[PDB]
């Protein structure tokens with residue numbers, strides 16, 4: 001479940017940070033990065049609580 | 051090529067058309083062994099797996 005969750009969109013524009021970095025400038029990719037990091041932190045917290 | 055975990059594990063060569071395996075490397079949490087500090091200052095280092 002964790003591994004499958006890893007590759008989710010999380011309401012962002014893409015599921016791979018490598019694409020996000022190369023798509024635009026850091027000022028406009030930091031939002032997507034922040035959304036990814038919040039989602040993944042939420043998932044990790046839930047896994048550890050379980 | 052993908053495994054159960056939806057992760058790539060084998061990619062065919064676009065150049066000469068061969069099947070190539072991929073495998074991640076160098077995973078581990080560094081751990082240090084010590085017999086306390088009061089009676090010694092020599093330690094032992096362990097690498098995980």
Ligand SMILES: *[C@@H]1O[C@H](CO)[C@@H](O)[C@H](O)[C@H]1NC(C)=O
Nearest residue numbers: 062063064065066067068069
């Ligand atoms: C790839 O190009 C090389 C260079 O000409 C050739 O020797 C080889 O047969 C080619 N492989 C293909 C087209 O699958």
Ligand SMILES: *[C@@H]1O[C@H](CO)[C@@H](O)[C@H](O)[C@H]1NC(C)=O
Nearest residue numbers: 084085086087088089090091
């Ligand atoms: C260290 O070992 C000596 C020898 O027994 C003892 O006198 C001393 O109280 C010890 N110190 C600590 C901090 O354990």
